[PDB]
Amino acid sequence: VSKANVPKIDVSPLFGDDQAAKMRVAQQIDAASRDTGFFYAVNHGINVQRLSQKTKEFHMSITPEEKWDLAIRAYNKEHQDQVRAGYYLSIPGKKAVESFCYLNPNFTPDHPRIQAKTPTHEVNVWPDETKHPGFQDFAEQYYWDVFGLSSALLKGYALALGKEENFFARHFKPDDTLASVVLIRYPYLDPYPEAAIKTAADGTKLSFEWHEDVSLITVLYQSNVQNLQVETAAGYQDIEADDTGYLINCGSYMAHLTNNYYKAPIDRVKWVNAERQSLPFFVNLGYDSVIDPFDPREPNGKSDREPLSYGDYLQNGLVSLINKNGQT
Ligand SMILES: CC(C)[C@@H](NC(=O)[C@H](CS)NC(=O)CCC[C@H](N)C(=O)O)C(=O)O
Ligand SMILES: [Fe+3]
């Protein structure tokens, strides 16, 4: 098994006013997006130390009673409104992974998409504040911290494609974004149940099978345990870990709108018997956001692909990923 070229890109100029320097970042994003599809964003400004600390404290202290009380509908029939947000239980002996997903903190009973019961919009559920002091505040501020990083990365992608720097970010708004954070725990288990391990076609033991991301882009922090592999024509390649940088890649919505000039890379999660953390931020737009496709490889730049409304893309994509790779 070979190793993916995953360049480390200093993205801090995307926060600044040096336009030529932003173009030099944009070039690097273009190159990475045309090669393996991945890059590490470094010099990003986010306190990833605290993020890993607060997440571990939550995972290791939440009780079975709290997990039922917060469980999504797939684990608790009482919670019919929780399709996306809430706790995703492990099944000891069968399923090792467990996680907690939350959405836009601005999705409240006051929000018109909650009032209208629009699919993919939900009000976040939270544990008792006194049982998990500071957790909700941490989690909501992390959402906006990584929102700000993601908005800057979207400026880099727009420039990389020959667009004005707000081409994507103008659709990425705090009042309506469908973006999600998932706080994933992968446990150490002894013995590790074979029922929780899948075997790939090439024989590799996996915790999660191949898939394209359902996102515009994916902004991922993981603890320092190597596990990801990207598919290339030469086979699956190991993605090296970096627990200070953010692993970035395009989702299938970007592959659609660029006429596949920036492909959505296929990745999978190797089985590793180790306590670790996987904390993705899925950069989703608003429910009615439509980006007109284009083809940066054509002289006239024209694409015949349908402009796709993002909310319907997200709803169909999330169900499809569950049907293909199982309920997480
Ligand atoms: C590969 C990582 C990003 C991570 N996998 C994942 O997060 C996988 C594959 S991208 N993602 C999903 O299943 C979609 C979660 C969507 C979320 N409930 C929501 O409603 O928005 C892992 O470590 O398993
Ligand atoms: Fe993925």
Question: How is this structure best described in words?
Answer:
- With 328 residues, the protein is α+β, with helices and mostly antiparallel strands.
- It has one domain (2-325): B-lactam Antibiotic, Isopenicillin N Synthase, Chain (Jelly Rolls).
- The chain has 7 helices and 16 strands.
- Strands 2-3-12-9-14-6-5-4 form an 8-stranded mixed beta sheet.
- It is globular and about 60 Å long.
- The two termini are 27 Å apart.
- 39% of the residues are buried.
- Bound molecules: L-D-(A-aminoadipoyl)-L-cysteinyl-D-valine (ACV) and fe (iii) ion (FE).
- The site of fe (iii) ion (FE) has 3 residues, from loops.
- InterPro entries: DIOX_N (IPR026992), IPNS-like_FE2OG_OXY (IPR044861), IPNS-like_sf (IPR027443), Isopenicillin-N_synth_CS (IPR002057), Oxoglu/Fe-dep_dioxygenase_dom (IPR005123).
- Its cofactor is Fe(2+).
- It catalyses: N-[(5S)-5-amino-5-carboxypentanoyl]-L-cysteinyl-D-valine + O2 = isopenicillin N + 2 H2O.
- One of its GO terms (biological process) is penicillin biosynthetic process.
Keywords:
globular, 328 residues, binds L-D-(A-aminoadipoyl)-L-cysteinyl-D-valine, alpha+beta, Jelly Rolls, 16 strands, 7 helices
